[PDB]
Design a protein around this ligand. Structure first.
Ligand SMILES: O=C(CCCC[C@@H]1SC[C@@H]2NC(=O)N[C@@H]21)NCCN(Cc1ccccn1)Cc1ccccn1
Ligand SMILES: O=C(CCCC[C@@H]1SC[C@@H]2NC(=O)N[C@@H]21)NCCN(Cc1ccccn1)Cc1ccccn1
Ligand SMILES: O=C(CCCC[C@@H]1SC[C@@H]2NC(=O)N[C@@H]21)NCCN(Cc1ccccn1)Cc1ccccn1
Ligand SMILES: O=C(CCCC[C@@H]1SC[C@@H]2NC(=O)N[C@@H]21)NCCN(Cc1ccccn1)Cc1ccccn1
Ligand SMILES: [Cu+2]
Ligand SMILES: [Cu+2]
Ligand SMILES: [Cu+2]
Ligand SMILES: [Cu+2]
Ligand SMILES: [Cu+2]
Ligand SMILES: [Cu+2]
Ligand SMILES: [Cu+2]
Ligand SMILES: [Cu+2]
Lengths: 123, 123, 123, 123
């Protein structure tokens, strides 16, 4: 189904680069490079996608996580993207995301940022 | 650090069961069984955690994804949990989550549910 | 400041119509007409905005609520939009929103949808 | 219905104080005092609630907004709470919230915090 459609390099509206392989078993593996924030170079990502989506024209549900630690920096935080892949001539992955920081209990009420990223095969 | 603290069986307030192994490399692997919704038995999960958290008393950031397809059912959806592990005698994983369904474009505006789950080692 | 910039008719990407008056005291009052969902005609809205925003080029924070009851229908739900107004030749109100339904306790875990709407003065 | 049940003083898990009047017309008016963050004393709030909820045991949908400007401080931000009132001997208002700051366009990707507050009549 969308193994081929999902696998590859994607770019979001911030200029970040999402490099992913979709496995036959529903796995997502690859790397993420954020153009913004406390981040440099690539970070490991892993996630899952619906490997047998509906055939009624609906998108394909998926999600993935990055923990913001690599050999260069550690931002003590993790983002999860939850979204759907929409195939076609202008393929897209439309997501919403939650970025949680490790905090003290006193600061936990502001631990989590929320936003939305749209990924395309171009740009 | 928290490899040992995170690895194991966790339970949330809904009675769902989160079985996870935290790898030395920052990986999270395991299974999720939801007590609610269009779900039965176990589903694969994968995620990431900060394997070198701060030492100032802050929690450990992490996240993981489940795509709601297994050998029994397919709910054409995926949940990502984004949160932090808080160690101690009453250890907890405090999360917020995004559940995205595969939808048509016309229905995409209501594709995504949001909520919050707290996981404990007991119950 | 942005009393004049905010007051007026706005339209989002779904074709919904947001008619608002920004008061000198920080109040937002007006009506909302959703182009989608269990909704017809106008609904009352009320909200608040920062009536003395920063002068460093930042946007103006604001939010508002609609309860989805009017003389025609009652969808037993409420949406809150939380966002910022960005002035200029292409003025925008960029929001994220939470739509909560009245549910039984058993169904409360899926009470809340999340999304994002961008409002413009045109379309 | 819940005009009487909602009107009054509520407290959340952070120790914040939510003072609200529910009008016959679906209006919510009152003040909010946050125990945390860049806030002191009371701030105006306004919102809406379903004034004719379902009779099947479901909660009552509601939401409200605070812009974090008063005579003492201005945090250039606004929170919206979206939730439901659940009546009974242990009445509760269960919410999720979005706190948006006024930001530059470059920083807009981290403009919005998300969390969840539970309000009770005691504490
Ligand atoms: O910056 C990071 C890691 C990189 C995140 C990039 C995001 S992921 C979603 C979005 N999509 C992208 O492609 N890129 C971005 N984590 C901390 C975020 N902090 C704010 C922030 C924003 C800008 C600069 C520094 N900090 C929060 C914080 C909470 C406590 C202490 C410290 N910080
Ligand atoms: O139910 C599932 C899979 C299981 C999710 C369990 C969640 S994960 C977060 C939370 N924490 C847990 O431990 N369990 C729950 N996905 C569809 C959710 N749908 C609603 C829903 C709720 C209850 C029953 C059926 N559907 C939405 C929908 C959107 C379009 C079409 C159809 N459905
Ligand atoms: O549809 C409404 C009211 C109108 C909402 C329009 C939103 S507000 C955010 C976004 N921006 C807009 O301009 N329009 C939309 N409330 C129920 C939403 N339900 C789903 C839904 C989606 C489509 C059709 C019917 N239902 C959920 C539900 C949970 C339990 C029982 C029943 N329903
Ligand atoms: O603090 C406020 C106003 C009060 C919010 C209290 C919230 S409302 C939800 C929750 N429930 C409550 O009862 N109280 C809290 N706004 C800025 C939040 N900022 C973080 C923050 C957290 C702690 C201390 C200072 N700042 C973000 C920021 C983004 C850019 C620049 C500056 N700041
Ligand atoms: Cu930061
Ligand atoms: Cu199917
Ligand atoms: Cu469902
Ligand atoms: Cu450090
Ligand atoms: Cu509905
Ligand atoms: Cu200022
Ligand atoms: Cu702040
Ligand atoms: Cu009804």
């Amino acid at each position: 189904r969308d193994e081929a459609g999902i696998t590859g390099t994607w770019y979001n509206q911030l200029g970040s680069t999402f490099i992913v392989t979709a496995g036959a078993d529903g796995a997502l593996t690859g790397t993420y490079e954020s153009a913004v924030g406390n981040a440099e170079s690539r970070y490991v990502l892993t996630g899952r996608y619906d490997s047998a989506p509906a055939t009624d024209g609906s998108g394909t549900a998926l999600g993935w996580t990055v923990a913001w630690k690599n050999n260069y920096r550690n931002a003590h935080s993790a983002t999860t993207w939850s979204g759907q892949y929409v195939g076609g001539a202008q393929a897209r992955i439309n997501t919403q995301w939650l970025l949680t920081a490790g905090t003290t209990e006193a600061n936990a009420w502001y631990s989590t940022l929320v936003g939305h990223d749209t990924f395309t095969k171009v740009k």
